[PDB]
Design an enzyme around this catalytic site. Structure first.
Site, short mmCIF file in Angstrom:
data_model
loop_
_atom_site.label_atom_id
_atom_site.label_comp_id
_atom_site.label_asym_id
_atom_site.label_seq_id
_atom_site.Cartn_x
_atom_site.Cartn_y
_atom_site.Cartn_z
N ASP A 111 0.62 7.76 3.65
CA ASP A 111 0.55 6.29 3.89
C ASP A 111 -0.85 5.94 4.45
O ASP A 111 -1.02 5.77 5.68
CB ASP A 111 1.66 5.93 4.88
N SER A 153 1.23 0.85 13.63
CA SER A 153 0.84 1.25 12.28
C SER A 153 -0.63 1.37 12.08
O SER A 153 -1.31 0.44 12.35
CB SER A 153 1.22 0.16 11.25
N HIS A 188 0.63 0.76 3.77
CA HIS A 188 1.45 -0.41 4.00
C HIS A 188 0.68 -1.54 4.68
O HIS A 188 1.04 -2.76 4.48
CB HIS A 188 2.81 -0.06 4.65
#
Ligand SMILES: [K+]
Ligand SMILES: [K+]
Ligand SMILES: [K+]
Ligand SMILES: [K+]
EC number: 3.4.14.-
Lengths: 687, 687
Positions: free
Chosen positions: B206, B622, B64
């Site tokens: 991810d 993240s 992402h």
């Protein structure tokens, strides 16, 4: 552990049960000529199970088993359904009409007797070997005439087992004065009832309490005020000890049906016709009803119960198909038959293989008929409310009044013509996609022939012109009837037409049942000769069985675990005052706030609600007693998880559970919610 | 364990970290003048975190985080977004425009310097103490002019901490040639992305991989083909050892914001205005969009991304409100302030109590304004697409073409006027219920004044008469324009009117921020003087922090447990070829079927996917590296569970987790899906 075992099979299972933790002597669980724990188990009102829990004839069962009785005694003024009911003295216990509890007094293997009597029948393909009439005649003969007069309250029945390979005779003792004693409020008895149907973890206090009444010597008697509580020969002691992970548990009750001896071709049929059609058609009907109920709060009120009812067997089908897809059901049945076929070849006996191939052939042969039947049944007969609109027959007028009664029952306070139209349009769309013109009920050919394929037009026409299309249209009809109009009425023609097709399918399908039955007698005989009965249970057939296993949770999916025990904390987490199914009773809330758990909670002060176990149960086990290693009652069975519903075909050790109300929670609700101390005092509550 | 800690705070936390299992020497984790594991952590493209994992400048981050770069290099012909991208030699790695990675070269406490400089400012209520402009001037002054010329690629920044009670100066090293190396297919990088947003258990791989390029001495350089991989001073060794329950884990990254020093009045405000309004208004908008998307597959395609976007902060609000309701957030903040107030009384220092009361007063005073602002923002500005229709200004024609561009962007391939009308009717209904006539944006008074309270009529009128009500109506306008018509256009008047009210609310609210800020400086100063910083972390502010804890699952609700680790079995359970988010890549499917896991699976042959940990993270974490007790990389952080999102206010030890891709799974996908062996060879993979 796997199996719904005959009482005669206790010796064969006893070693396996002891390895799981059983401490009872065999004789104390079941024996043929004395008293045993079996004598405390009852068939409650012809389907459910219950259990005797006092020396004065107190019976515990599920709230859902007691519901109709509780309902009947309720008035909007004394609404026992909503508030609970607690009789504070024996004289306040409420008699019930057309109720019964049945004890299984005696069981006897009569296989030699029946097989000998069957030799008289000339035709090898007669089905008398499974006939209730025929078998009742044999039972009656065996017991003697006058049996009944010499045996107050006793009757006899013979049942077939193992596809007609084993027969037992049961001697039943039936009591018909069974009085309502206690019930929780519905918010407790039905907590999570719809949304948590088939679900573990579960938080429902699903119980109710009755008392068997009798004559002064404890014989059955119809209701009379001179009747007195039964002093039973055996009742359950109630454990306060609780449960822990891996504890032994066992259940006795009356499971209805199972299909353990399915061939692989029968599994494929159950998947691809019966389940696949039920899932498809109900997902359509439900989807329409949901959309309508969400759009309009009056529609929600009208259709919620019909929606939940549809959902019950839908969720079951979903679960079964999950098992067929993920747990190897078909391959299990395939392996069973390949083992027997290879053995039969070694024995020089081809009859087992012939039996399997006969079952395969019959299943192949009925496939399109059965598909047609399930399509019409799920799509229309159950799918579309106006399928069950009035069909006439029949100077007066009396007949108009008779039609009016059926019409009013059809288009009642819960019926919306507009909802029914939307459902019918969607259901008939799928139905017409799947069933070719040549096989349609005749009236439905009109969609192609008169409405140019437009199902909405077609359904709009039925309602526009039928005398049952609205109350207005019904009243105009009667008023000014017409014979004539009625003969041509597009709803009556629709209803007649679909029920005609349904009936013809049913009648053409019925003959296919018998060759399968006959072949299964041979198939099962094979299986038993080859491997014996120790690890091959007889299919359920509404008779008394035991099952054993352990208190244990499971993992439904990767990285998730459900434990063995729910608590009152979980009830409070689910509380929702604006949803009837998650209302928390104010007394129970107050109990949780104060931690007023008496002696019913665990040593860490957490109050148990339910637990789950690896027992093997099905429909008819509602209300069944759950016993610990010493035979003491630790809970009352009430459901099974959706992951396990494939268990009727193949027991799933890692997923299938019985869902059980903790007896400690039962006691708590008696004590702190009911305030019914005398019921505690009459039980034998042991540490 | 609680806290997002400064690197300067490592000494204060080191004992607690060792009790949790840390084995590293302090100096090796962070130190001020040498090399430490801190030197392997980067700020990836101005928000996300990443980590250096080879001696040739390989950088791991989330898919992402890499998405935009992967998208940019994709053509429908080489669709790397869909197929993954694997450069097979360094020369095939793709440069990116306007990208950066930032290393934190040096950190220095400058609190004395800044406080001394602030004495120059006369006004005690100046907010220069938090001003980025002001603070940059101080940074620039401190580093010297020419700093930049004497320090290739270095820049400096000063940031405020602890409400203005502590200041750090950071020296940043910025690289702008950062090339795409590797990415899984989207089906792996975004598995479960919407439906599993904020959810544990989680099954998403991810990740994406970049490489820092530089001059031949490793200094930053703009993109050039003469640039060479960075030879970094520190990179992470990659552990093959895996994780087990209770293992120590730690994370370094750049968390954005937290509100650890909320007063109880601020918690109540966040609940009753910001969250309650967001939940109410979005549940309305979403409910309408759902109904429409389910009814029509083209609407599903058009609105799915807008629906998922709305859902992202909605789900967050839900989770936060759950925490306020069930986990004691308000009482925690209440206790904090009562402790400080009682202490302040002992010290004869009332300024702390005055600070809390000032925050309370300000929050009370803005309540109706803030409620109005959130109502308009959630109800209309975000709620209703036609709020963001074109507003003019402006012999030709050029302006018509400029309006046409904005109109086409408004009413684009994903916009339905019919969906927007239905959403507007429902949103404006709730909006008009909550906001009284006297406080309405002026155009909305017309509902009462001109349409008799009929919102549908009102919205129907806007679309009927606006030049933006349809493409047809736009084309008729230009064609034959009218100045005139445009000045009176009910959509333009609606859009102007609501943005006018929004702006005025915003402007009236802004001044209330400052007294709270000023009071918090005093409040936090108090808290620190009284109890110290060892168990009181500074709020996140986009700067480098560490957090520590353990690999561990949790119980979300009674009788349910989520474990610490997901597996590839869980991916397969979720497979759904007809849902883009649960598509299983064919190579990975083949891997699972063959059990071709190499050295990446556990000793029982189960292949790990993700794990969770008690670290304390938020937005900006993240991509953050997850280290074991010895500093080796064991995973890459990618999300946090919805139960834990209240953690931005009060860490929830029993519920809050960071959600982390297992590095073993990263390696598996590199190896077996990518076929990119050279990336494995360049890493230092340790047992
Ligand atoms: K059920
Ligand atoms: K069954
Ligand atoms: K998220
Ligand atoms: K945040």
């Amino acid at each position: 552990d796997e199996g719904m075992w005959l009482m005669q099979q206790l010796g064969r299972k006893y070693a396996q049960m002891k390895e799981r933790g059983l401490k009872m002597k065999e004789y104390d669980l079941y024996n043929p000529n004395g008293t045993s724990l079996k004598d405390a188990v009852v068939l409650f009102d012809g389907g459910c199970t219950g259990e005797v829990v006092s020396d004065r004839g107190l019976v515990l069962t599920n709230h859902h088993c007691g519901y109709d009785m509780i309902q009947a005694h309720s008035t909007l003024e004394h609404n026992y359904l909503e508030n609970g009911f607690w009789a504070m003295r024996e004289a306040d216990e409420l008699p019930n009409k057309d109720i019964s509890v049945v004890f299984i007094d005696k069981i006897e293997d009569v296989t030699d007797y029946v097989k000998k009597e069957l030799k008289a029948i000339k035709d090898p393909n007669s089905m008398d070997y499974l006939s209730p009439k025929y078998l009742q005649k044999l039972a009656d003969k065996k017991a003697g005439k006058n049996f009944s007069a010499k045996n107050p309250g006793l009757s006899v029945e013979i049942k077939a087992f193992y596809g007609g390979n084993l027969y037992l005779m049961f001697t039943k003792k039936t009591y018909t004065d069974v009085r309502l004693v206690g019930a929780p409020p519905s918010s407790i008895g039905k907590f999570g009832a719809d949304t948590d149907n088939w679900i573990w973890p579960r938080h429902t206090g699903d119980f109710s309490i009755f008392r068997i009444y009798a004559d002064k010597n404890g014989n059955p008697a119809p209701y009379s005020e001179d009747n007195v509580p039964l002093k039973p020969k055996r009742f359950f002691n109630i454990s306060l000890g609780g449960v822990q992970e891996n504890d032994y548990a066992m259940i006795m009750g009356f499971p209805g049906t199972t299909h353990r001896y399915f061939t692989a071709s029968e599994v494929d049929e159950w998947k691809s016709i019966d389940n696949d059609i039920r899932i498809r058609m109900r997902d359509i009907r439900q989807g329409v009803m949901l959309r309508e109920m969400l759009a309009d709060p009056q529609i929600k009120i009208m259709y919620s119960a019909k929606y939940a009812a549809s959902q019950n067997a839908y969720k079951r089908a979903i679960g079964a198909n999950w098992a067929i897809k993920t747990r190897g059901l078909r391959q299990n049945k395939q392996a069973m038959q390949d083992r027997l076929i290879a053995w039969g070849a070694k024995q020089g006996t081809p009859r087992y293989e012939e039996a399997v191939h006969e079952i395969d052939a019959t299943v192949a042969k009925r496939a399109d008929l059965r598909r047609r039947y399930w399509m019409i049944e799920e799509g229309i007969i159950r799918g579309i409310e106006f399928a069950r609109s009035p069909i006439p027959t029949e100077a007066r007028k009396e007949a108009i009044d008779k039609i009016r009664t059926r019409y009013s029952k059809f288009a009642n306070k819960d019926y919306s013509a507009e909802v029914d139209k939307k459902v019918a349009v969607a259901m008939l769309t799928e139905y017409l996609k799947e069933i070719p013109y040549e096989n349609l009920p005749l009236h439905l050919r009109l969609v192609k022939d008169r409405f140019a394929g437009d199902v909405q037009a077609y359904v709009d026409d039925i309602f526009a012109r039928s005398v049952f299309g609205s109350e207005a249209q019904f009243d105009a009809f009667a008023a000014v009837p017409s014979v004539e109009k009625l003969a041509e009425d597009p709803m009556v023609l629709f209803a007649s037409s679909v029920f005609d097709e349904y009936r013809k399918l049913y009648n053409e399908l019925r003959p296919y049942d018998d060759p399968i039955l006959r072949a299964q007698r041979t198939y099962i005989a094979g299986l038993l000769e080859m491997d014996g009965d120790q690890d091959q249970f007889p299919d359920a057939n509404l008779t008394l069985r035991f099952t054993y296993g352990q208190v244990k949770g499971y993992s439904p999916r990767d990285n998730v675990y459900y434990g063995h025990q729910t608590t009152l904390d979980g009830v409070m987490e689910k509380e929702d005052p604006d949803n009837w199914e998650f209302v928390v009773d104010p007394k129970l809330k107050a109990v949780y706030e104060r931690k007023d758990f008496g002696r019913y909670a665990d040593r860490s002060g957490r109050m148990p609600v339910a637990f789950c176990a690896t027992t093997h149960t099905t429909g008819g086990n509602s209300g069944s007693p759950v016993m610990n290693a010493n035979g003491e009652l630790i809970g009352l069975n009430f459901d099974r998880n959706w992951e396990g519903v494939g268990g009727d075909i193949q027991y799933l050790a890692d997923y299938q559970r019985s869902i059980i109300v903790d007896i400690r929670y039962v006691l708590l609700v008696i004590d702190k919610v009911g305030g019914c101390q005398r019921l505690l005092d009459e039980m034998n509550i042991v540490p």
